[PDB]
Design an enzyme around this catalytic site. Structure first.
Site, short mmCIF file in Angstrom:
data_model
loop_
_atom_site.label_atom_id
_atom_site.label_comp_id
_atom_site.label_asym_id
_atom_site.label_seq_id
_atom_site.Cartn_x
_atom_site.Cartn_y
_atom_site.Cartn_z
N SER A 47 0.53 -1.42 -0.15
CA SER A 47 0.01 -0.07 0.07
C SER A 47 0.53 1.76 -0.09
CB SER A 47 -1.02 -0.29 1.05
OG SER A 47 -2.10 -1.14 1.11
N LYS A 50 -0.27 3.36 -2.96
CA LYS A 50 -1.01 4.60 -2.85
C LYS A 50 -0.44 5.93 -3.23
CE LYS A 50 -4.43 1.44 -0.79
NZ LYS A 50 -3.60 0.10 -0.49
N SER A 95 -6.02 2.87 3.68
CA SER A 95 -5.51 2.22 3.35
C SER A 95 -6.73 1.11 2.29
CB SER A 95 -4.64 0.75 3.44
OG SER A 95 -3.02 0.46 2.14
N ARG A 227 5.89 -0.16 13.32
CA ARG A 227 5.82 0.11 11.75
C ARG A 227 6.26 1.29 12.40
NH1 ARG A 227 1.49 -1.47 7.63
NH2 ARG A 227 0.08 -0.57 9.61
C1 LIG Z 1 -5.56 -4.63 9.64
N1 LIG Z 1 -5.04 -5.74 8.19
C2 LIG Z 1 -5.15 -6.60 8.28
C3 LIG Z 1 -4.31 -6.78 7.08
C4 LIG Z 1 -4.54 -5.68 5.96
C5 LIG Z 1 -4.51 -4.36 7.39
C6 LIG Z 1 -5.00 -3.07 7.24
C7 LIG Z 1 -6.43 -2.30 6.97
C8 LIG Z 1 -6.24 -1.08 6.78
C9 LIG Z 1 -4.94 -0.28 7.29
C10 LIG Z 1 -3.52 -1.33 7.63
C11 LIG Z 1 -2.72 0.11 7.45
O1 LIG Z 1 -1.14 -0.93 7.61
O2 LIG Z 1 -2.61 0.41 8.00
C12 LIG Z 1 -3.71 -2.07 7.48
#
Ligand SMILES: Cn1cccc1-c1cccc(C(=O)O)c1
Ligand SMILES: [Cl-]
Length: 242
Positions: A47, A50, A95, A227
């Site tokens: 992502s 993006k 995202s 992160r």
């Molecule tokens: C919670 N999740 C599991 C797989 C992918 C996500 C996800 C969804 C929206 C945002 C984020 C992020 O890294 O900010 C991660």
């Protein structure tokens, strides 16, 4: 010039993690990392893609402005925040992959490839599905290549309009207080090993900008908050933020 500071590894070990933080001092034109080798290892952007994807969609008119609403297609997905209407700001905040896949389909393979070449972005290889190559295709970019792309964006030097660059930087806004502004984008690559998390962007200070790009092994979604937390620990250690 690039300098290696292995003392930052303690911030990864503290959390039983492995990864890299890369920093660039814009005023001094100097880079710092805990791991020079991993700083140049190229991974799927997931992502973080993006950022370029938004730039291209805006410059081509696929996205009119940051208010245009992209309606939910009615498919219930595992991420609750994706099952709703979005604009460019919220789609980057949460995202929202399916919004950006529609963008990519409208951009098309040919214009996508041409733009990434004009951006000098990573290995410039979009092989795969036009609407998933940044998740499970051939594109690869390292933490130092993310910084070199972000510096172009910061300075409005990418080969898209200034307006497009201004809108995406607005959409990247993540945190702001009296001490600093962070414009950044997270990523989570799960489709192809190694599963990793990303955070790339910059810290705006009164009289300097510090660009950053970090990635870390992410075998499960439990560690995603590391992160930002590890990156901030490095920023605090270097006295870039309080
Ligand atoms: C919670 N999740 C599991 C797989 C992918 C996500 C996800 C969804 C929206 C945002 C984020 C992020 O890294 O900010 C991660
Ligand atoms: Cl802003």
């Amino acid at each position: 010039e690039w300098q290696e500071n292995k003392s930052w590894n303690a911030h990864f070990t503290e959390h039983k993690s492995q990864g890299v933080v890369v920093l660039w001092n814009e005023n001094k034109q100097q880079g710092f990392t805990n791991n020079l080798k991993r700083a140049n290892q190229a991974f799927l952007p997931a992502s973080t893609f993006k950022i370029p994807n938004s730039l291209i969609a805006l410059d081509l008119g696929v996205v009119k402005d940051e208010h245009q609403v992209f309606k939910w297609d009615g498919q219930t997905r595992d991420i609750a925040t994706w099952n709703r209407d979005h604009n460019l700001i919220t789609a980057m905040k949460y995202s929202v992959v399916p919004v950006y896949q529609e963008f990519a389909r409208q951009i098309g393979e040919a214009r996508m490839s041409k733009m990434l070449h004009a951006f000098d972005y990573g290995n410039e290889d979009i092989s795969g599905n036009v609407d998933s190559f940044w998740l499970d295709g051939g594109i690869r970019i390292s933490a130092t290549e993310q910084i070199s792309f972000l510096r172009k964006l910061y300075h409005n030097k990418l080969h898209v309009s200034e307006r497009s660059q201004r809108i995406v930087k607005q959409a990247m806004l993540t945190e702001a207080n009296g001490d600093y502004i962070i414009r950044a984008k997270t990523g989570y690559s799960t489709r192809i090993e190694p599963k990793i998390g990303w955070w790339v962007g910059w810290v705006e200070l009164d009289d300097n900008v510090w660009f950053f790009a970090m990635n870390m092994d992410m075998p499960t979604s439990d560690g995603l908050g590391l992160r930002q937390a590890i990156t901030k620990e490095v920023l605090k250690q270097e006295k870039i933020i309080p």
